[PDB]
Structures are given as C-alpha cells and as structure tokens.
Amino acid sequence: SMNPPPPETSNPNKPKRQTNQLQYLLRVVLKTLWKHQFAWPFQQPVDAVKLNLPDYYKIIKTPMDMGTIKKRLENNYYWNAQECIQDFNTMFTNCYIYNKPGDDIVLMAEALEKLFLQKINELPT
Numbered sequence: 001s002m003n004p005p006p007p008e009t010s011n012p013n014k015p016k017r018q019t020n021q022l023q024y025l026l027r028v029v030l031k032t033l034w035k036h037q038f039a040w041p042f043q044q045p046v047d048a049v050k051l052n053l054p055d056y057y058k059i060i061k062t063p064m065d066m067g068t069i070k071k072r073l074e075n076n077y078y079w080n081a082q083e084c085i086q087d088f089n090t091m092f093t094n095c096y097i098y099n100k101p102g103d104d105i106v107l108m109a110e111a112l113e114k115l116f117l118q119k120i121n122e123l124p125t
C-alpha cells in the first residue's frame with residue numbers, strides 16, 4: 001500500500017508511565033492545540049491515498065501526528081514528557097521537510113509550533 005501502518009499507540013513490551021507533566025501534555029497542551037484553526041491537517045496520520053501524495057512516505061520515514069500522540073497519551077504509552085515532546089517536534093519537522101518555506105501548510109505548522117512551545121515552556125512539577 002501507499003500508506004504504511006500508522007505509528008503504534010500501544011506496545012506491550014514497552015513500559016508505561018504516568019506523570020504530572022504527561023497529564024498536562026494531554027489535558028492542556030494537546031487538547032488546546034487540537035482546537036486551533038490550523039490543527040486539522042495534523043489531527044490524523046497523513047493519508048497518501050486520500051490526499052493523493054504517493055510521495056509522502058517516500059520522503060517521511062518517521063511520521064507523526066496529533067491523533068497518534070493523543071492516543072499514546074491516553075494509553076500511558078510514554079515514559080516521560082520529553083518522549084511526548086519529541087513526537088510533537090517530529091510532527092513539526094516532518095512538515096517542514098515534506099514541504100517548502102512559505103507554503104500554507106508550513107505557515108500552519110509554524111503557528112502551531114509557537115503555541116506548543118509557549119505551552120511547554122513551563123510544565124507542572
């Protein structure tokens with residue numbers, strides 16, 4: 001298929017964890033970003049069949065999206081906040097890689113990244 005399987009949202013041989021920071025990343029960071037007017041392209045894995053982008057997964061080898069991140073947080077999939085933050089950063093970076101400076105989609109990612117950084121600047125202790 002043109003679409004690989006989406007990233008795992010559970011893994012039984014990976015240990016789980018819950019922390020105040022991870023709770024915050026779900027309740028505040030993810031759930032607030034989700035509502036932004038520019039969040040929609042990032043709420044699910046890129047569907048190359050739907051969007052007609054047979055090139056997407058030829059270019060992006062570590063795909064990530066907020067739908068996956070949300071499910072991971074709900075699963076307690078992550079060990080710590082930094083691991084989750086890395087997924088957000090991978091999502092943003094993928095967008096910059098797959099596209100071009102100034103593209104509408106890149107403008108969207110740039111705005112979301114700024115808001116994301118604002119919110120993770122300070123996490124609970």
Ligand SMILES: O=c1[nH]c(-c2ccc(Cl)c(S(=O)(=O)NC3CCCC3)c2)cs1
Nearest residue numbers: 041042046051052053094095098099105
């Ligand atoms: O690098 C990424 N692009 C996208 C994405 C998702 C949906 C849509 Cl419509 C778009 S887009 O920038 O408006 N390009 C559309 C024009 C043809 C394919 C989709 C990008 C999510 S991550």
